[PDB]
Amino acid sequence: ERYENLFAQLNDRREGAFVPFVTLGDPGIEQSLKIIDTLIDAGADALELGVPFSDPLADGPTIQNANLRAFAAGVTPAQCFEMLALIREKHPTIPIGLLMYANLVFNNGIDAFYARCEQVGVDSVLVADVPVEESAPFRQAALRHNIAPIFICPPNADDDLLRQVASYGRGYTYLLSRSGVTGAENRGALPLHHLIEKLKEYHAAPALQGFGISSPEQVSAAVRAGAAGAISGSAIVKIIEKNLASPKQMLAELRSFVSAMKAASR
Amino acid sequence: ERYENLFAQLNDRREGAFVPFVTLGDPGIEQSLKIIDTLIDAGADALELGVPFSDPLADGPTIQNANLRAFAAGVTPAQCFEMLALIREKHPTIPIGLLMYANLVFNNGIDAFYARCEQVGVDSVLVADVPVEESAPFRQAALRHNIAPIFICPPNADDDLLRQVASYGRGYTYLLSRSGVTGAENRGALPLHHLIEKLKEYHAAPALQGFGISSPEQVSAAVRAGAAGAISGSAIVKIIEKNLASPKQMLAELRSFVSAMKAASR
Amino acid sequence: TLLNPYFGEFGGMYVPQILMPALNQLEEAFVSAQKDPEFQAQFADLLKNYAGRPTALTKCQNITAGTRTTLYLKREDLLHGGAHKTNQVLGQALLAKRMGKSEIIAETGAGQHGVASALASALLGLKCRIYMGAKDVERQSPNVFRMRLMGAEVIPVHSGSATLKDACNEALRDWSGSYETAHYMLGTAAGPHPYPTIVREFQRMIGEETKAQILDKEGRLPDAVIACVGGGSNAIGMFADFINDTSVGLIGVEPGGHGIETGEHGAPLKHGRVGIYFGMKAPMMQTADGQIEESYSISAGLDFPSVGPQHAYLNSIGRADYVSITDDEALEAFKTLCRHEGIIPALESSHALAHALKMMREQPEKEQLLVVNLSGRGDKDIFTVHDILKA
Amino acid sequence: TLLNPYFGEFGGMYVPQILMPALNQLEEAFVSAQKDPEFQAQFADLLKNYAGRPTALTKCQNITAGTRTTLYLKREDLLHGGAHKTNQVLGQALLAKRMGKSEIIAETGAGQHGVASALASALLGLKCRIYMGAKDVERQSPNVFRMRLMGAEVIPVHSGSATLKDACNEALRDWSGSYETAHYMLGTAAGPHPYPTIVREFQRMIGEETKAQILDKEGRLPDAVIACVGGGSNAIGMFADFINDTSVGLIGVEPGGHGIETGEHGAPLKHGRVGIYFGMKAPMMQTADGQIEESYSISAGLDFPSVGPQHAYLNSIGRADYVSITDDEALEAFKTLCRHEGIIPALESSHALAHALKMMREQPEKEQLLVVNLSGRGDKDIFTVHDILKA
Ligand SMILES: CC1=C(O)/C(=C\[NH+]=C(/CN2CCc3ccccc32)C(=O)O)C(COP(=O)(O)O)=CN1
């Protein structure tokens, strides 16, 4: 819905989306909320947001440490939902996606989790350790509460998976840049054109590329290859950790970067 | 021969023999020769003398350390035979017995070893790790060179052993006070009267008691039990080690002790 | 999938999408190998001629004296490498070769699986990479250098509790980036399907031999078989062949650590709550919020805040019973076996023994025939145990 | 005596007179036990069900690749306790009980005989007292505390070389004072009769099993069997059943230490001279004057300046051949087995392996079927080997 309107508008302006990722509450609730405000102002088309998890099996050291900082600031999932409410209250139209691990969704009941997402104004949920094979109760709960369930199209995807992701997913399709875990240092080099074209053939939700995107050139390459946008996590988070001593110099360095990344999507 | 004359004379004076033991060359060749002279002067009836061996399996720490000191002074078996020649040259009649371990006897040929003993004026040889069961080449070589082979009568001796020791031995029979290794600290308590009487029955060479004899009362007890004498090793050697700093005070303390021990044999 | 990934509600394949092909490839390779007489012969040959199977079943007469308990110990401590871990590692290595993999990723806590991974890789021509928590590097040090002697890379993990869970996390992250050349040799009957199934089938000889040996020596089946439960491999290896013999009790023993009431323990089956982590839906130690808790045990091999799905299922239906044993109870059992049977057991196996000794002592005139799985030897634990003696 | 104490010129009973009854009692007890079907059954039961016999015979295909050598390893490293020492210790303990003894005196160098003595005593209800050279306490430390865990008293010997010879001396001195209540569990096929004979008969299953296993796997006997020689027990255990099979070479391997020419070695059979010590007439390392020399080996278990009388005899008649292997050659063999077969051998056994690898490499197109006695595992050696790697 918010995703639909976003991609519609981006299509009319003939540009790709830039979707940054941050950990909610990193390095604290208040600085995080300011970081996110700077991200939207600097040109973020949508947001991907992580709820601090004890064991983030799909994340490298940068985002691992992001989770740790949030935990040092005592950030809980309950506080994360409070933050999300505040973000939605300030920004009524920006798509908001959550990066979840399965235990945080399953903990108080899968249905209750998505009901809560709807209540606070979340648009999509990606559960990193739930493959299509285990997705049924998750995607059913998502759809019941008007939440887009996000599915992953990996480089090693075959045709059967392509069609599954295309029918089950809503909002956007996550196009993985490479194998491995999140990390700016490791860039995906393999051409992804043939996967992008087939998703369009089976009429999948528009594709966003993620993992290892840390430079405007990578964003530009993703959009030129046919993907509807790009996601950057660790690059953004590195600016948070290297500027912990300088909150004001943090936001300026964040602003510069997001502007440069969004420009490349045009 | 020298033993025969000794026991004959002791019988006429109705007393037992006191036979001290020292390690040849402990703490040095010259001090050892002075120690031995003090022993004979103080009343030693015969001598039992150890040739320093690397692995004295029948000896406790005192005599072990005696061996070590001699080895520090660089005392060899060749030097021991030179000492023996000097001792015999000064004292023509005193019985001289050697305490040997088998390897020192076997090393250059068993026959040659006893030939050398005869040559320097040794009267008997006791090989500590040769039981009657292995004694044949040793006792044959001894007799060929007019050396008394010394056999051990242990407390656990049966009648078959008693008769063996009685026929094979010459000079004296070693009557063991107890099991274990040499040591003044450990005194033999078991009554040995029945063994002493049976040796006399089978006409064994006169009996000398050894191991743990460190006091005049023990000497007196041995002779009163019927043994022809007593042997003291570790008690003598303790006076050597405790007075290493005082060579003159060593000989005085040695003299006192030997006199007191010999007195008890009267 | 070719096989059922679930045991009742427990199990599944809760991994990132990227890893599903690897899991599917592994499942297909296993199903194929199970039907392959040549695979089975090669596996049997390594177990017999290299690892030294069948292992003994030792009757312990001293420790049961004055009671009506007869106790046997299944001697996996006598297996090459010093633990039951060697069994399934040889099988998985052969599957790795069958899948054309050249590398092995493993995780280890007690270092026994790491030793097993290193030795199998040395034997069968694989390059082996091992994750171990830095605390475990210290408390299970003899195993650290055994691994390195055999050509394996040992990688200390400092994050989190710096124990087994953290080793697993790193191994998983590594595999998600190198699955094309590396087989992930998971070390227990837990994790995503097909691992709980494969690890059971490759540990199943424990119970099969026990059954044959006890029938030969006693003319009947045991009243109960008793095994410690880290992730569940030695226990399921023992249990499997007896599951359909309903008269045979199955007792799994979780570590009670400093005591269940202290929260410093490793007993999620009886004292945790179903969650999703380590690629599976299984009982875990978790906060109210659903964060994974850190476990604790004196033994590195049981120090893991989850448990394999099949044990969770066998418990739920009442087929198997699970109990806990504290650090102090495991130590007493360790000392007892050393002094009265002259066997030095692993501290993991000592939990199993401790519970058997409790069954005996609590009811000394109850006639019972018990088998304890002595899953490993305690050479790796001697410095740790020494240091605790004093205080 | 009931049995012949000599093997040609070598052997005998060169002990103080006091100890002859003990030696005679032991001989009579052994002869009686050998004819006793109940003793034999009890012994067989402990070996099978407690110690884990029969041990494997492992074919090593990696290390012989590109040559015409086929190599098997007799896996005494898989025996309970970690070495072949356990075999004869179980037999001697049963003889101790048969003689009504309540105590055990032993000596140990590698600590494997000490571990074996402690475990057997724990199992069979005997009080165990163990002498070990203080250097060996350091370089073979894992074994020191294994012994102490099992209820044995470990007594460090500081005198002399503070190694095996000095441990033996103390044990002998102790026994001469306590033979009435204590059985002296001599740890090798050396010393006074009946020990060389008893230790062979209680180690003889090594060669018997090897013969059956090699015939089963190869359909013929080996070209040579190869064993390290400390005092001679593992070698004579391997050799014994093949002595009458004249086509089978018997190769015993003495430690060459820093090199024979340095005089820092433990090879008296080939480089010493007949002497009388340790209760026997046997080759020893000795000075011109007949003092016993100190031996040297990197391995504590071979670090002994004499050898058992039967090996001295088999050499003299040409039936068995003896060679030496240096510290550095044993280390290379250790590393080689670890990395290419995934077995960590004792440094003692590594001498045997080293010589086998020399037979192979020197003549790589010679067709030979060799068995190496892998007398123990190298867990006790890992710290020592680590410290040498660096330099
Ligand atoms: C002698 C013995 C062990 O060594 C042992 C465990 N050891 C580990 C930890 N392993 C390695 C990966 C793993 C993940 C979870 C739990 C255990 C393990 C190791 O790395 O030697 C267990 C308990 O294990 P289960 O039999 O329940 O599988 C029992 N006995």
Ligand SMILES: CC1=C(O)/C(=C\[NH+]=C(/CN2CCc3ccccc32)C(=O)O)C(COP(=O)(O)O)=CN1
């Ligand atoms: C794994 C292994 C050993 O541990 C070992 C020896 N170990 C000793 C020393 N033992 C104890 C008394 C003794 C006296 C003389 C020589 C050796 C020994 C020990 O005390 O573990 C030998 C070599 O011994 P042989 O098989 O030739 O008898 C080979 N292999």
Ligand SMILES: O=P(O)(O)OCCNS(=O)(=O)c1ccc(OC(F)(F)F)cc1
């Ligand atoms: O720029 P990088 O390399 O840090 O990548 C950032 C990604 N953050 S995220 O929320 O999209 C994200 C998306 C999917 C993830 O796991 C899965 F693929 F298995 F599902 C993990 C993180």
Ligand SMILES: O=P(O)(O)OCCNS(=O)(=O)c1ccc(OC(F)(F)F)cc1
């Ligand atoms: O007074 P102690 O206790 O030192 O005893 C001294 C003894 N010295 S000795 O030369 O007679 C002597 C005699 C016999 C020995 O061994 C044997 F009995 F096995 F043959 C050892 C030493």
Ligand SMILES: [Cs+]
């Ligand atoms: Cs019983």
Ligand SMILES: [Cs+]
């Ligand atoms: Cs656990």
Ligand SMILES: [Cs+]
């Ligand atoms: Cs076996």
Ligand SMILES: [Cs+]
């Ligand atoms: Cs070959």
Ligand SMILES: [Cs+]
């Ligand atoms: Cs030797």
